[PDB]
């Protein structure tokens, strides 16, 4: 069925399912639609024989250069996507809800890539985008398929961040702190202003664009301090680096970062250490440092994230596309 966003009861049940599911994703939370306020939300779900929600998909519809919309369920749906027969049923609900307005319904769940799963999906009629598409560019997957994920369940007795690492790494993490770097965290306007300054500075330094502050303000309005937290690293009165982490489902996700120019005293390591400590303190299963371009030392993202994730990066199935308008799809989506 389709969720009536104006039905508080229905919304609460949908949210409860999302928040409690081991497959929950912040980008599938109804709060994500508030962040992506320029996209149209269309949410659907399936119920089991007891009438309880067993699967849900929060879609966001965006415009394209054609008469069709692009329907996207970021890191959704929320269910065991390998249960493809169940997935088909949920997608059928989504297709009904879209009512021919979209040329495609795409979802990129955080499930490991495998030839078997890839094949099963294709056998069910989905078009998958992973190893068959470009690594970067306008043809690449929206979300990086290679992600550096720290599995904290491998360290049941870990009390602090240092307990998860080899001595060489403990040294790297301790460095900023011994040099005076201090981290404070929260989700108020003050921390947001600190984040934004480092974020725009970082953007200007790398000659790249940055999202407007309103984007993050909507995020702050949508998520409480137990879900969204901004970590700010400073040294004796000087702002050095920041990071935004979102706690949801089985993980804490390092989503945004910023760092001032010049000497930052390895503040980014301090930020990571505190985000990981938050994951430990909350008994979270995973700490997701996000994507990398490649598992190579030539990738600055990899080198940095590899300090905190020694396991191989997780490689996801990529984009699973339910093609609705084949002609427009072929026009807008290519390898
Ligand atoms: Mg258009
Ligand atoms: Mg713990
Ligand atoms: Mg590790």
UniProtKB/Swiss-Prot annotation:
Instruction: Please give the annotated consequence of changing residue 256 to F.
Output: Reduces activity 2-fold
Q: Which reaction does it catalyse?
A: UDP-N-acetyl-alpha-D-muramoyl-L-alanyl-gamma-D-glutamyl-L-lysyl-D-alanyl-D-alanine + L-alanyl-tRNA(Ala) = UDP-N-acetyl-alpha-D-muramoyl-L-alanyl-gamma-D-glutamyl-N(6)-(L-alanyl)-L-lysyl-D-alanyl-D-alanine + tRNA(Ala) + H(+)
- Pfam assignment, any one: FemAB
Mutating residue 143 to T: effect?
Slightly reduces activity
Keyword terms, alphabetized: Acyltransferase, Cell shape, Cell wall biogenesis/degradation, Peptidoglycan synthesis, Transferase
Relate the outcome reported for changing residue 318 to S: Reduces activity 8-fold
Q: Where is this site: Important for catalytic activity?
A: 108, 319
Q: What is its EC number?
A: 2.3.2.10
- Could you list the residue ranges that cross the membrane? none
- Outcome when changing residue 305 to N: Reduces activity 11-fold
Consequence the record notes for mutating residue 28 to T: Loss of activity
Phenotype upon changing residue 318 to V: Reduces activity 20-fold
Quote the protein name from its UniProt record: UDP-N-acetylmuramoylpentapeptide-lysine N(6)-alanyltransferase
Record organism: Weissella viridescens (Lactobacillus viridescens)
The UniProt gene name for this protein comes to: femX
